[PDB]
Design a protein around this ligand. Sequence first.
Ligand SMILES: CC(C)CN(C[C@@H](O)[C@H](Cc1ccccc1)NC(=O)O[C@H]1CO[C@H]2OCC[C@H]21)S(=O)(=O)c1ccc(N)cc1
Ligand SMILES: [Cl-]
Lengths: 99, 99
Amino acid sequence: PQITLWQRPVITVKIGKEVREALLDTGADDTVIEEIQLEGKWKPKMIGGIGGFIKVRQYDNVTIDIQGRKAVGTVLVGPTPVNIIGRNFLTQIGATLNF
Amino acid sequence: PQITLWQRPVITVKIGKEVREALLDTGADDTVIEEIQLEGKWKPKMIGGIGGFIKVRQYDNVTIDIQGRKAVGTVLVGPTPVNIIGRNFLTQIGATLNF
Ligand SMILES: CC(C)CN(C[C@@H](O)[C@H](Cc1ccccc1)NC(=O)O[C@H]1CO[C@H]2OCC[C@H]21)S(=O)(=O)c1ccc(N)cc1
Ligand SMILES: [Cl-]
């Protein structure tokens, strides 16, 4: 779809076979979700945003389905204020910014 | 243009009287710049992100030029890690997120 930006671009997705809502975020390098258990081993990491750093659990090779588009990649789990889909998955579904 | 997301969508923009670079950020409601002299009156606000809150100065009615697309609107000035153009200006330049 073509998504205008008069409201936040929040979409329903499936992450690791769980339905979640998330913000499509071109300003995020990475995908960050709060309170989910995913497959495989995780690795601790730190990421920073506008207000400082948070600790996250990094899971690799997680499947995300965005309106029929499947991608597999890294998901960070930690106390983000809102769930975010970042560029690591937006590139895999061929998302672009257009003006 | 049609901008892919394999690298951060950083573009050059003119903000008030100053050329700056900034990140095109669909996950940001508002545009936030660090250390820019803007004219007019301002009001103090906080905004929050990953990691917590920062205190900004809110300036209304600032002119930005993005690749020839001119827009007027609110700019927040404060200690953001990187400059970001948020939806309040993305909508005004006709940007959409597509996939
Ligand atoms: C500031 C960006 C360079 C980075 N962020 C993405 C950004 O889109 C967040 C995404 C975001 C969105 C909501 C809440 C927290 C974070 N937006 C944000 O902080 O926007 C602020 C300015 O406008 C306001 O509207 C939203 C909060 C304010 S980030 O959330 O900190 C971030 C950092 C690292 C990764 N991997 C993923 C995301
Ligand atoms: Cl700059």
